[PDB]
């Protein structure tokens, strides 16, 4: 799947996660600032919310 990829300090860019999943890391509570996107499914935390997906393609938007 073609997914979004970036960090805290970079623009979003498309990337071939291909085999497997994508993630969308953000601030769990308001303001729900997006903290990053990439390939895989990384742990979250009290402050970090991670939303995982596989199918839709560029789904981690």
């Amino acid at each position: 799947t073609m997914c979004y990829s970036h960090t805290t300090t970079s623009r979003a860019i498309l990337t071939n996660c291909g085999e497997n999943s994508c993630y969308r890391k953000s601030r769990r509570h308001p303001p729900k600032m997006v903290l990053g996107r990439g390939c895989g499914c990384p742990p979250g935390d009290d402050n970090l919310e991670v939303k995982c997906c596989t199918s839709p393609d560029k789904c981690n938007y």
């Binding site: 960090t7 805290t8 623009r11 601030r27 308001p30 303001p31 600032m33």
Partner: protein, 537 residues
């Protein structure tokens, strides 16, 4: 050519000629005004750039101050538009000068721009801050600087010598001093310098008004959609060291000295990674690192100073857009996204109030709901859309500005107030958002004049007309043409009459009351309530 060469106290510069429909302008971009705040200098107030041998290339914007990049909506102009466009660096303290062509003879008035971005983001290089049209059309000198943001600018361990706080504001000041010293080199008149900013930019302006060491650096102030006494604009000392220590612990750190020492060893990106954790939480329109009331830069809280301050001999221009609160709602409030019409249920509304109005008793939200509910139509989604957009709008902007405006006028200043209510035809946010926070700028800077952009004819006029307003204020401390009938007169805002004008494609229209009924809630009554709900614990 000819006058792209200019010499300032520090050394030689080489500028560049920018093209405008009306004619050329002289730009000098990326002038070093401080010793790069790196290594041991991180968190430290700026030191004046030492003089250089040779000729400095000032044909292009220098790197943007190291900041967080807003990625909410990948590939979306409306957010990406304020994102960093130059590379990202801590070595970022550079400023820019625009000046007419040919360089004026007699000294001309200077406008200084301070960008906003919630004190966590921003850059002088943003396409919407291009000074070329304003300088060409109203022949004045335009200067803007970069100032440190996020932790690099505002992380504070109050009373600390290693991290004093407020250094981002200090960056702004150093540049203002640089202007006294060097603006004549461009035809600029250091005895006529006007400050104008937007949002955090506006809140800064307002703080130079209240910080004596800065009072002799400028003569006029324009605050757009912001103000020092906003609830988001300043943090207390207790709170500030709470946040800095949280950040420290989050980053493995580790005595304030060894704390900051360690902090200074971490990559810049590691610090930005953890910026948003340190927020008290459950809020929209709140930011981790903002100016502190340390007793130094500000001796009391902006509100305290505004009340005592004498303001005779000052002229201020204050204003807001028509829908201040709208776009912030997509950063949390349930049911809000830009990709539909955000028609919320009565139940998403009640939940949003808690978001748009952070840490506030239960009884307090009732009181908000009481005021912002149309009891003839309590469930109307469209009505509840605007309502929460007003709650956020009025709480964070329109009421802090209107308070200020009234306190100034009443205490010596001459104030002029506006409501910007015209939606850019090029606007890329949904229609429900109306005229959102920060969308009067592109007009003020006359960007519609750029022929490679797709603005309408009436709009190109609008910006012209508007630039005139700003220019007339900087020159004279009065926006409306030195002597112009049968043009409607823009009267001064006063504490009683409370007059303002509505800037749109129609001619000037005079209204009374800047959200006068709403603000009486926020300013007069709410604090009497919180005083009581707090002595109920």
């Amino acid at each position: 050519d000819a006058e792209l060469l200019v010499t300032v106290r520090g050394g030689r510069l080489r500028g560049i000629r920018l093209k405008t429909p009306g004619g050329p302008v002289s730009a000098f971009l990326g002038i070093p005004f401080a010793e790069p705040p790196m290594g041991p200098r991180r968190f430290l107030p700026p030191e004046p750039k030492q003089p250089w041998s040779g000729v400095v290339d000032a044909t292009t914007f220098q790197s943007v101050c190291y900041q967080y990049v807003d990625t909410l909506y990948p590939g979306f102009e409306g957010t990406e538009m304020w994102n960093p466009n130059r590379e990202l660096s801590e070595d970022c303290l550079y400023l820019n000068v625009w000046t007419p062509y040919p360089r004026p003879t007699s000294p001309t008035p200077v406008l200084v721009w301070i960008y906003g971005g919630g004190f966590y983001s921003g850059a002088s290089s943003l396409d919407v801050y291009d000074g070329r049209f304003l300088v060409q059309a109203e022949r004045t000198v335009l200067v803007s600087m970069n100032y440190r943001v996020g932790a690099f600018g505002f992380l504070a361990l109050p009373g600390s010598r290693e991290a004093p706080g407020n250094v981002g504001l200090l960056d702004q000041r150093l540049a203002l001093q640089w202007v006294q010293e060097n603006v004549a080199a461009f035809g600029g008149d250091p005895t006529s310098v006007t400050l104008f900013g937007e949002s955090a930019g506006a809140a800064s302006v307002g703080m130079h008004l209240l910080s004596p060491p800065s009072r002799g650096l400028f003569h006029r102030a324009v605050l757009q959609s912001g103000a020092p006494n906003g609830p988001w604009a300043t943090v207390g000392m207790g709170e500030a060291r709470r946040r800095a220590t949280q950040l420290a612990h989050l980053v493995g750190c580790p005595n304030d000295t060894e704390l900051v020492a360690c902090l200074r060893t971490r990559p810049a990106q590691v610090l930005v990674n953890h910026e948003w954790h340190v927020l008290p939480q459950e809020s929209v329109f709140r930011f981790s690192f903002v100016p502190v009331v340390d007793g130094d830069f500000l001796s009391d809280t902006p509100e305290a100073l505004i009340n005592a301050g004498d303001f005779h001999g000052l002229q201020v221009l204050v204003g807001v857009v028509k829908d201040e609160g709208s776009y912030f709602l997509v950063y949390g409030a349930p049911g809000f996204s830009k990709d539909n019409e955000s028609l919320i249920s009565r139940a998403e509304f009640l939940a949003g109030v808690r978001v748009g109005v952070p840490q506030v008793s239960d009884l307090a939200a009732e009181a908000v709901v009481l005021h912002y509910t149309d009891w003839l139509h309590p469930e109307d989604p469209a009505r509840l859309r605007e309502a929460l957009s007003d709650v956020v709008g009025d709480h964070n902007v329109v009421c802090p500005v209107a308070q200020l405006a009234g306190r100034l006028a009443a205490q010596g200043a001459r104030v002029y107030a506006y409501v910007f209510e015209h939606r850019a035809s090029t606007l890329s946010w949904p229609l429900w958002m109306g005229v959102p926070h920060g969308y009067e700028i592109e007009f003020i800077f006359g960007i519609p004049l750029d022929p490679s952009r797709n603005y309408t004819a009436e709009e190109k006029i609008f910006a012209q007309r508007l630039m005139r307003y700003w220019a007339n204020f900087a020159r004279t401390g009065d926006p409306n043409e030195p002597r112009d009938p049968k043009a409607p007169q823009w009267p001064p805002y006063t504490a009683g009459a409370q007059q303002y004008v509505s800037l749109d494609l129609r001619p000037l229209e005079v209204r009374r009351g800047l959200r006068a009924q709403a603000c009486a809630f926020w300013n007069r009554f709410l604090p009497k309530l919180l005083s009581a709900t707090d002595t109920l614990d």
